[PDB]
UniProtKB/Swiss-Prot annotation, chains A, B:
<comment type="similarity">
    <text>Belongs to the glutamate-gated ion channel (TC 1.A.10.1) family. GRIA2 subfamily.</text>
</comment>
<feature type="modified residue" description="Phosphoserine; by PKG">
    <location>
        <position position="184"/>
    </location>
</feature>
<feature type="binding site">
    <location>
        <position position="89"/>
    </location>
    <ligand>
        <name>L-glutamate</name>
    </ligand>
</feature>
<feature type="binding site">
    <location>
        <position position="96"/>
    </location>
    <ligand>
        <name>L-glutamate</name>
    </ligand>
</feature>
<feature type="disulfide bond">
    <location>
        <begin position="206"/>
        <end position="261"/>
    </location>
</feature>
<feature type="site" description="Interaction with the cone snail toxin Con-ikot-ikot">
    <location>
        <position position="64"/>
    </location>
</feature>
<feature type="binding site">
    <location>
        <position position="91"/>
    </location>
    <ligand>
        <name>L-glutamate</name>
    </ligand>
</feature>
<feature type="modified residue" description="Phosphoserine; by PKC">
    <location>
        <position position="150"/>
    </location>
</feature>
<feature type="site" description="Crucial to convey clamshell closure to channel opening">
    <location>
        <position position="121"/>
    </location>
</feature>
<comment type="subunit">
    <text>Homotetramer or heterotetramer of pore-forming glutamate receptor subunits. Tetramers may be formed by the dimerization of dimers. May interact with MPP4. Forms a ternary complex with GRIP1 and CSPG4. Interacts with ATAD1 in an ATP-dependent manner. ATAD1-catalyzed ATP hydrolysis disrupts binding to ATAD1 and to GRIP1 and leads to AMPAR complex disassembly. Interacts with GRIP2. Interacts with GRIP1. Interacts with NSF via its C-terminus. Interacts with CACNG2, PICK1 and GRIP2. Interacts with GRIA1 and SYNDIG1. Part of a complex containing GRIA2, NSF and NAPA and/or NAPB.</text>
</comment>
<feature type="glycosylation site" description="N-linked (GlcNAc...) asparagine">
    <location>
        <position position="3"/>
    </location>
</feature>
<feature type="binding site">
    <location>
        <position position="193"/>
    </location>
    <ligand>
        <name>L-glutamate</name>
    </ligand>
</feature>
<protein>
    <recommendedName>
        <fullName>Glutamate receptor 2</fullName>
    </recommendedName>
</protein>
<feature type="topological domain" description="Extracellular">
    <location>
        <begin position="120"/>
        <end position="262"/>
    </location>
</feature>
<feature type="site" description="Interaction with the cone snail toxin Con-ikot-ikot">
    <location>
        <position position="148"/>
    </location>
</feature>
<comment type="function">
    <text>Ionotropic glutamate receptor that functions as a ligand-gated cation channel, gated by L-glutamate and glutamatergic agonists such as alpha-amino-3-hydroxy-5-methyl-4-isoxazolepropionic acid (AMPA), quisqualic acid, and kainic acid. L-glutamate acts as an excitatory neurotransmitter at many synapses in the central nervous system and plays an important role in fast excitatory synaptic transmission.</text>
</comment>
<feature type="binding site">
    <location>
        <position position="143"/>
    </location>
    <ligand>
        <name>L-glutamate</name>
    </ligand>
</feature>
Amino acid sequence: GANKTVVVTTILESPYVMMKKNHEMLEGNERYEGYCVDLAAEIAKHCGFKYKLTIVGDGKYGARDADTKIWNGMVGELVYGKADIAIAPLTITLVREEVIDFSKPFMSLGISIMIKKGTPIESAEDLSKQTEIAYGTLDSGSTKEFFRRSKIAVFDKMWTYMRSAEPSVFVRTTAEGVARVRKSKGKYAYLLESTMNEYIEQRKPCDTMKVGGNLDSKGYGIATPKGSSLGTPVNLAVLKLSEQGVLDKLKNKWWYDKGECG
Amino acid sequence: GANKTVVVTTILESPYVMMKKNHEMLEGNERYEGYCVDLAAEIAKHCGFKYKLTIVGDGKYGARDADTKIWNGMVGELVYGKADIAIAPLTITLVREEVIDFSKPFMSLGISIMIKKGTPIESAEDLSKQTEIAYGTLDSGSTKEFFRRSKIAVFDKMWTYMRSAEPSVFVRTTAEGVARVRKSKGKYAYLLESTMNEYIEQRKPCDTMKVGGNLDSKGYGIATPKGSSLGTPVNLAVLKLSEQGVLDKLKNKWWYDKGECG
Ligand SMILES: NCCCNC(=O)c1c(NC(=O)Cn2nc(C(F)(F)F)c3c2CCCC3)sc2c1CCCC2
Ligand SMILES: N[C@@H](CCC(=O)O)C(=O)O
Ligand SMILES: N[C@@H](CCC(=O)O)C(=O)O
């Protein structure tokens, strides 16, 4: 039938999507800025659609409830027909691939360790072999699932600790994880995606550090409801933007051009 | 109908697929070893198919002839129905995505510079601004197309030079490119994927170096004829192998465990 306004689900996660400081003075898509705001504009231009940016109601990435089997977050939005596409730092995983479609990756990342500067930790092995420094992850996302599912001794050991740590080591948002690292005098390390870790390392007050190598290697994809006719042109648009250098240019724009730590 | 033997196209490219030294004494799949030999076995196990490894007839990755519009290499094999799947270091590109299917990436890479040790070159910018050191790429693959298509000043300048350099700076195989770097007393630099570059840097006689950062960021995918029912389970198998750490384990096996330079 007639072209419709494509409803885009995304998440408030810096520097992917952020409220403009003058957002009260603005309407619709103009309220927001960031990497994924720019990316949504590029994808829409190349695929020739009109779109509305919306922030996921529950503020989550997406996980299936073990009891209800219901998906929450942006993944839920797609599965239950509440959004047409997700343009966000949404990690490509086996369990999600079964229920939604993903483009080829538009950005790579791996799980990584964030410490307050001078914390005596170099690696996941270090974290696993001590108790004084607590560590955890975001809940409802791919990092938590990684540890939950891992057969690898060090990661299995970390999971056994985190799942029963008191008080809880899990956080509701990335900004919470960062706030805990900053305020815990080095007694909390935060396990998060290297992309978010590298962005925060370039933000005032420049008191955090990404340490050691990444624990895994993967990517974010643009997601669509399974079988959506949008998936094909969106995937081809991601490949063009990659091959044109536009994705690299957008990463430089939002991570390093505006970087606050020198 | 009945299950059939899946015909796998691949390429002799170290350490992805190599002849076993005792290959004369062996039959069928047992002739070969390498990262992609191991990967093919894993994919086949998880998807439950029997398969025959074959080496692409023309020894190429795949390009479309500007005049005939005919695809050569492994891409051609898939397009014209001569193979059922390609399990090789085959780069995901826009032009290929239009005519074949690709899984999510099983390995990441970017274009990179290989020099003989002590060559006074640090970057693509350095290469572009001098003439004494010749440089080129593999023909019939994604690296050559990258330079051909690039709008980026430095890469555009490199392409203008390479396309008309005499004698020719392009090579038929990776091993040729390496042999030219090694034998040219530092007067030839070779532009190749960081994966191949990093493997050769760990092989005797340890006389080559990867220099500077990568020029782009992308990945290899397992490829199938467009619409093949094989694409779905193969893609899911790649995600499992990624999430299990098996892909990382296979990279360590073939690059670094056996590494010859310390
Ligand atoms: N080391 C274990 C697996 C290695 N993994 C990958 O390379 C890998 C990924 N790699 C990448 O995304 C690298 N990568 N691949 C591409 C692509 F798709 F080839 F064009 C692009 C990028 C980065 C920039 C945009 C274009 S995504 C992903 C995996 C495995 C799990 C699923 C999601
Ligand atoms: N990108 C992750 C969220 C962040 C994290 O889990 O570290 C996801 O899509 O679930
Ligand atoms: N992986 C490349 C070949 C190697 C190169 O072009 O550097 C391709 O699929 O075409």
